[PDB]
């Protein structure tokens, strides 16, 4: 059935799109991770997938089934992998998954992929998956496969937007786990999966300039959040979404011209 | 408030695991061609839909499904040479299963059902289970129990088979994108099926061995191993009934409250 | 001369592959418990005997067999909890098949038959074949052909099944250390079988799912899934000729001179 | 000596026998650093910082990892450059894992990993997690690890302004810039020829990455920022700031 | 009554292991070219022959041998460029040894003798042992002991060496398909040897370094590194008794009741 | 400088641009060497030999590998000694493999691997094979590798009689003995305290190995033979013989 999601297409519909010779494919990469007492744990898959869908509808791309499990949650950016519910993969597993998928897409005749990450710690493993796959493609005689990797939040860098989102100053994505940014998007996209009343208020989380292992539960706010989402809103969610969708769409048109 | 783990907050999940008798379910599928008439995420949709109903019926939680599975085999899945089909190497599937089990044990969970919806996944899901349990044993854990199954194995009653194929069954090794799955999809996701696109062809026959590289000439052009022309919502509802009931009973038997 | 590669000098082997259409055969077995009446190397002995005879009949050569195979499954071979059974992890068996194919391709060989004698080996043998062919492709080789088979799949004639099981045939999984293998052993290695130790118990019945860790209480104590009481040298010789004939014909078809 | 490689096994054994010995492991890379610096800067710098920290707190420094993870365009220029010799992530993770396993066997239980190569981080972390998982299966849960990239200890605004009068722009476009070149000028003056620096505006990248890496998107010299204003004085400043801060972090994480 | 684990039922193996002090022996060889006069499974045949005799004298059990070994190196086996030679990657061999030790420990065995018959295998067997022992420690097992040995290292007595090479020994480096092995073969498997085919060329001379890719011209065309012209059944029986006696005593020493 | 780590990528690129440049990679280990020597001996010696050889033939030396494969009892004392820090075989193999892959990406096609740790051999060899296999898949078949253990070049009876009057015995029993100790005295005199040598008779082992390692089977000092008769003079003889032998071998295998 006609859709922007590859999973909803028959192989003939998929084949027809790739036969175009310039088809863009998008792959959401998330995680199953705790997101405080106010949001569900599949946030990292829901948000990038929602972004991909909208971008795909505007530029005419297709969206691959997203990767539901990501790399281990880090303390200073995701709370820590000691919370229950958070289910993480080892680095080699996530890399191997990205690598196999690129190898397969190349077999289909696809040559354009956008990897949209929604989980802070996935980046380097996604990157190693790309490198290893491109290496194999070369051995197979393929050097025209192009890949763009990005975390959708990096497109929200406009001062005017930042001020709107954070009237009291932005302290970097360093502590934006389950905070204003993600809660806003969820309020605008999946309100039934958020209960702002369960939001535990507390000052931003601050850590020294180093990490300790084993992780020290005490150095992470009990709720699992690194900053309060008390000021999150549907309107903020709407602004962030249009900003990301438009930025990413224009980025793709630039990198993958017809 | 659903049965999906991904839709709970960690506090809600922790509370469930806290009962000490909580049962977790994990669908393992694949992105694979399913003829001209069906979408490619059938192997994820069906076991996920079965897990949801079983979980609702017995009080279990459902983990996010594995969207990508093992390579497609010709004598059961047409072959991994079709476009769209996106398969992982066996080591990657095994490692994914193994990692998930390790994490569940860490949560304190000790009961897991793995519901496969893609033929070739089985042995790789099994190696994952074995490697994870060996690992849990090294960590001093030996009370984690796992039940693994392919939902179609629960459709054995002849009376049932009689109604689905009132002409003769030929085995789950000829039913790729045929009456069985198509009927389930018509009952569960009619918008993802278009019976008017079905390529009605005779059943495909294979010798008692496999050839590599896969020879495309030995698979029906549409990718199906048999015709889904006689598929229907009613057959789908019959199958669903049977699967949910049988699997639900099996879990009550293996994981008593 | 001999059909076993191991018993040839490199010069003879080289001359054989130099013909450009030489067929090679590799038996893949296992060291697994086979009840109170049979030895544990059955899974290697049988496929090797079949390859030997098939190879001699059609002019192929046989590679040293793989003595260790994948983990024994409960509903297939009793379970990997038994003493004696010595299994490899999936990646290990896969890597072995993959390395051997790579080497054969280096020799100039382009035709291989993998004959499995242990139920659970299949998928790992398949993954080994796939990863090998992927590599050969990177090396610019796409003319290497492989045929994988389990020798018991050629015994599918109702007339033969009837002569073997008048009372009825349940399947290949429940045939662990039963009439089939014991009959072949009586005709091939009678000194390694003792019918007097056979435990004549009813056929093992299993639910449509697997439980892990394996529960010993669910597998017949002797390790067999069905009685080999009615086994015989006569049945064994019938099985052997059907298997050798069928496999030799398949090879001649897949690998014409 | 504070370096393990310069001790006999008996001297090393005696030190760890104290029961509270802290070991340090520099993790660098062989990577291009512009026309003005040699390629082993990522090894030299953390090793120099470790040596000085160890001398002040009584720790030991392990031989440094000479090879690190693949250089990334937006933070290191890209792995398409000559000279840069990178390991696959699994190779680096495994090396870190093996070393931690061996140290646990010696009886050591305190390790500080000082990274000097940006992209090494996530792979050093995985190496730590896999090793600790192993140590747990072995019945060891008292092995503690502190991991850090020495440049993160330079966060005091007073210091930043003295290093960057015009302003600062994150440790991304720093590759081969002021920070590193200034340290080399103070520690290894003969391995840096500032006269060969190629002045150019700080590299700007869009909020995404492209593979295969496009050579045209990295400044020709391989630097992401100009080292023109780097100096020995800035070097001495950075050095003392990092040595003191890290020495104190270690005292708190690993009290005697 | 046999000493081969493969020829026992699982109940027989279980009794021997449960009896305690059971010593298992595992031959590790290779499929490798051995000149114009010998077959290619020599490296499996010899250590297996030695294990058999030792096990019969000391009451040990011998496991199915590893048929494929590590890549052949020029300065010791001619080079992995010859046809017939079928080598495994190091990790595959290491993993196979690790898996078997893990399983023997599960059976309850705690004593193992790895008898190597292929020069290049040694370090990969060692890593296998180490990775396996590390794993056993995680499992709480620290009383599993392993002895690894190349059977030729037991032929050290000057007297014996004089009777074998009256012209002067020259180390095992240049001893491939030469007098030592060809003699053991004449005494154990004369059928697989044909001295008439021996190429009496002088010992191979190599520089103190190795080159890759291997240069074919630096290895004697026959594949042997020394002539086996002076090999004899007599020499074979001498070496055999020497190795058997030495290995037997060594085992009694390392594995006391 | 002959050290790649000391060159800028521009310098390195120019040298490789010649199209006949020879690279050399020292492969060592962090391993106990008795009571009289430091533990980085296996890295220091091959690196020292490479430096001298490279200066004579105009080659370049890559950063050496600091950690090698596990120490074996009958040749290195045993991996049970404190201080010895070994990698698993897969890790060392992967390291060699990755480096070769990168040198190929550079355009280099000539590599000399100089092993200074007895137990590294087979894993270095497997790394090379895996690398060449992969290079073949990339359409590259003109990459040539020479592997060697520097001690294999001291084969002249005249040199041996001169080094071991009372008789030689074999590299397997040489761990921390006269050979390595003499080289250290001539090259790194500050890292060796001959006065700490334990003068015990050569070690004797049966023709087999036992695992787990039995500590009682290794001389207590960790040495397999006495270095009491080691000297700076002997070291200079060894060094010149090795340097000249390797230099000439490299000329024959990698002709100008
Ligand atoms: Cl996050
Ligand atoms: Cl299917
Ligand atoms: Cl079976
Ligand atoms: Cl950097
Ligand atoms: Cl040999
Ligand atoms: Cl040594
Ligand atoms: Zn999130
Ligand atoms: Zn996240
Ligand atoms: Zn399906
Ligand atoms: Zn499927
Ligand atoms: Zn069997
Ligand atoms: Zn079996
Ligand atoms: Zn740097
Ligand atoms: Zn760097
Ligand atoms: Zn041999
Ligand atoms: Zn050999
Ligand atoms: Zn040494
Ligand atoms: Zn050493």
Swiss-Prot record, chain A:
Where creatine is bound, by residue?
A: 77, 120, 173-174, 177
Pathway assignment reads: Amine and polyamine degradation; creatinine degradation
* Necessary cofactors: Zn(2+); Mn(2+)
Question: Where exactly is the site Coordinates a catalytic water molecule?
Answer: 121
Entry's cofactor comment: Binds 2 Zn(2+) ions or 1 Zn(2+) and 1 Mn(2+) per subunit. The Zn(2+) in the metal 1 binding site can be replaced with Mn(2+); however, the second zinc in metal binding site 2 is much more tightly bound and cannot be replaced. The enzyme with one zinc and one manganese ion is more active than that with two zinc ions.
Reaction catalysed by this enzyme: creatinine + H2O = creatine
Annotated EC: 3.5.2.10
Whether Hydrolase counts among this entry's keywords is yes
Give the pH-dependence text from the record.
Optimum pH is 7-9 for the forward and reverse reactions.
Q: What is the effect of changing residue 153 to F?
A: 340-fold decrease in catalytic efficiency
What does its activity-regulation comment describe? Is markedly inactivated in vitro by heavy metal ions, N-bromosuccinimide, ethoxyformic anhydride, and dye-sensitized photooxidation.
Tell me, how does this one assemble? Answer: Homohexamer; trimer of dimers.
Q: What is this protein called?
A: Creatinine amidohydrolase
Species: Pseudomonas putida (Arthrobacter siderocapsulatus)
């Amino acid at each position: 059935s006609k859709s922007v999601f590859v999973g909803e297409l028959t192989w003939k519909e998929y084949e027809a799109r790739v036969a175009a010779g310039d088809c863009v494919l998008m792959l959401p990469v998330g995680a199953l991770e705790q997101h405080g007492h106010h949001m569900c744990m599949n946030v990292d898959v829901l948000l990038p997938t929602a972004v991909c869908k909208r971008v795909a509808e505007r530029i005419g791309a297709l969206v691959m089934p997203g990767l539901q499990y990501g790399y281990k949650s880090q303390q200073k950016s995701g709370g820590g992998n000691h919370f229950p519910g958070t289910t993480s993969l080892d680095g080699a597993t996530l890399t191997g998954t990205v690598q196999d998928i690129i190898r397969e897409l190349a077999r289909h005749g696809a040559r354009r992929l956008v990897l949209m990450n929604g989980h802070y710690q996935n980046s380097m493993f996604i990157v190693e998956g790309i490198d290893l796959a491109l290496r194999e493609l070369r051995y197979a005689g393929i050097q025209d496969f192009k890949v763009v990797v990005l975390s959708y939040w990096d497109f929200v860098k406009d001062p005017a937007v930042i001020q709107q989102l954070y009237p009291e100053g932005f302290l970097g994505w360093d502590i934006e786990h389950g905070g204003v940014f993600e809660t806003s998007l969820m309020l605008a996209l999946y309100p039934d999966l958020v209960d702002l009343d369960r939001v535990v208020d507390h000052p931003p989380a601050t850590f020294p300039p180093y990490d300790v292992f084993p992780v020290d539960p005490a150095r992470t706010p009990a709720p699992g959040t690194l900053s309060s989402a008390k000021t999150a809103s549907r309107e903020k969610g709407e602004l962030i979404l249009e900003v990301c969708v438009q930025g990413i769409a224009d980025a793709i048109r630039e990198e993958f011209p017809p």
